[PDB]
Design a protein around this ligand. Structure first.
Ligand SMILES: [Ca+2]
Length: 401
């Protein structure tokens, strides 16, 4: 009775990328059912804009109650920043995964130094219009969120202003790939399974994995509408527990072949298992004369990483996402300062529910002791101290603040 979800039903959206694994596995391996959530519908979203629209309308309107998200979408939706003023409060409940993302670059840029650190290739990229007829063109999967941040950080770390020196745009994943094939797209912030296909099919090479840019960086999260969570507190915790067990299950190498088999299935990603087998072993052919990566720790991780617990949603990570938003001058009026960012974070991040669910499920030993993971370090030496985001912003060379 006390654990009995108020409802066993919920519609959770997902995008066909490795970040969705916990949702798919929690469902397919019976982890959701174990806790009473036998009516979970893991619904594939056409794209991020559609996922946003669907959670804004909610399940009662034919959309979704929550699901998988790039950060800080839950916060932006809560504030109605990306919903034309339609504020739909949401709660960030857990981080689904870390890594499993990367930046692909067109083959025409090989031997140019456009790798992890593009410093020496900065002028080349900056003068691409002069030398090649068009501004260097890069793409992400939705503005102002994860992929946009990853590619922006990467560019900026090397001296390339992503807003002024290049054409950074949101472009469908397929179109972008086709663009690189055609010779019109120069790079794109992607993630698995897209990277394997790009290298294998000689479409391009991997300049770097986000695992290299920011080891064990916060990635995508499970977030559900606040009205749903408020009305169904027990069901919410049941979902969290199913997710946690799924994440733990996925991280055991012995289960990864099955994980790959399931998510690649027709009813989910619908892709050849061969393209995900490597990444789930932490194996990536990088290309451009760079050594291949063969490290489980650099592949996608869903439960524990080299720093702490992956699933626990650290508020310090929400803070980085909003701080980086401020860095690029995103939502100038809605999030004009760090204090406002923090206020939004305290309304959105429900790490307390993760703690409670983990405790009830018997994962007390895995619960981080703090809402902050501490000072974060990027591949270029820049550090983000959650206690002083202002210092972080001021340490950055390229920014709009
Ligand atoms: Ca991603």
């Amino acid at each position: 009775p006390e654990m009995m979800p108020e409802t066993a039903n919920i519609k959770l959206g997902y995008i066909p990328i490795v970040e969705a694994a916990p949702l798919i596995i929690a469902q397919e391996k019976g982890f959701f059912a174990k806790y009473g959530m036998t009516g979970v519908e893991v619904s594939k979203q056409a794209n991020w804009a559609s996922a946003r629209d669907n959670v804004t309308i909610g399940s009662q309107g034919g959309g979704i109650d929550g699901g998988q998200w790039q950060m800080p979408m839950p916060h932006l939706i809560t504030e109605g920043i990306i919903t034309n003023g339609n504020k739909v409060p949401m709660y960030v409940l857990a981080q689904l995964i870390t890594q499993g993302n990367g930046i692909a670059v067109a083959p025409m840029h090989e031997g140019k130094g456009v790798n992890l650190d593009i410093t020496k290739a900065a002028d080349y990229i900056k003068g691409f219009n002069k030398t090649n007829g068009r501004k260097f063109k890069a793409a992400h999967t939705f503005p102002n969120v994860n992929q946009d941040f990853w590619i922006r950080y990467w560019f900026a770390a090397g001296g390339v202003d992503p807003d002024t020196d290049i054409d950074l745009l949101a472009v469908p994943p397929a179109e972008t790939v086709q663009g690189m094939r055609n010779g019109t797209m120069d790079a794109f912030s992607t993630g698995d399974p897209w990277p394997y296909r790009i290298v294998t099919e000689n479409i391009g090479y991997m300049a770097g994995l986000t695992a290299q840019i920011w080891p064990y960086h916060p990635e995508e999260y499970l977030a559900i509408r606040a009205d749903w969570v408020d009305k169904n507190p027990k069901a919410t915790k049941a979902l969290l527990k199913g997710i946690m067990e799924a994440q733990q299950w996925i991280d055991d190498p012995k289960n990864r072949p099955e994980v790959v088999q399931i998510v690649s299935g027709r009813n989910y990603f619908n892709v050849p298992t061969t393209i995900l087998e490597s990444p789930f072993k932490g194996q990536y052919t990088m290309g451009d004369g760079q050594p291949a990566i063969d490290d489980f720790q650099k592949g996608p991780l869903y439960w524990k990483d080299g720093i702490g617990n992956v699933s626990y949603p650290y508020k310090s990570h929400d803070l980085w996402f909003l701080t980086e938003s401020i860095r690029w001058g995103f939502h100038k009026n809605a999030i004009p300062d760090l204090d406002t960012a923090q206020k939004i974070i305290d309304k959105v991040n429900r790490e307390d529910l993760w703690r409670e669910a983990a405790t009830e499920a018997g994962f007390t030993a895995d619960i981080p002791s703090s809402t902050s993971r501490g000072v974060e370090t990027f591949f270029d030496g820049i550090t983000f101290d959650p206690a002083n985001p202002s210092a972080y912003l001021q340490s950055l060379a390229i920014k709009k603040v």
